[PDB]
């Protein structure tokens, strides 16, 4: 029964790799985080950065959120990201994915004590 900082962790953090060096990239993790699961989820980023250098994020540059909330952080500095999203192909539980590696900023919603990084909100 998953905290929302563990949850996040699950869903977007990958410390290991430095990028998606394959095409296969999406759907292996989407798979090995458990996110195909009920269902395929349409969009997941993943993010080839220690975790202590995106918890700093929640301190960064505070925007708004998506949602017009106004605890969304951007990073100062860009950051190696896999951006995972469904191809229209796909069919549950067949999930496929199109993996993009880039460097973006990314923009995450903090909550807590400590202030963790508890969504994704998007990449820039
Ligand atoms: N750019 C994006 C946009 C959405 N997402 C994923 O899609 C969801 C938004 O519907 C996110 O939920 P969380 O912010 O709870 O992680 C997230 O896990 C993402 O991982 N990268």
């Known amino acids: 029964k998953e905290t929302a900082a563990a949850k996040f962790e699950r869903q977007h953090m990958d410390s290991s790799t430095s990028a998606a060096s394959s095409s296969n990239y999406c759907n292996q993790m989407m798979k090995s985080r458990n996110l195909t699961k009920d269902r395929c989820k349409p969009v997941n980023t993943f993010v080839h950065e220690s975790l202590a ?7 960064q540059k505070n925007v708004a ?3 017009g909330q106004t605890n969304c952080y951007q990073s100062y500095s860009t950051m190696s990201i896999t951006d ?3 191809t229209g192909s796909s069919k549950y539980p067949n999930c496929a994915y199109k993996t993009t590696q880039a460097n973006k900023h990314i923009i995450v919603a903090c909550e807590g004590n400590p202030y963790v990084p508890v969504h994704f909100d998007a990449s820039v």
Do not use: I
């Open 84 to 86: 995972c999203r469904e």
């Open 53 to 59: 250098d995106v918890q700093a994020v929640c301190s």
């Open 65 to 67: 959120c998506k949602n």
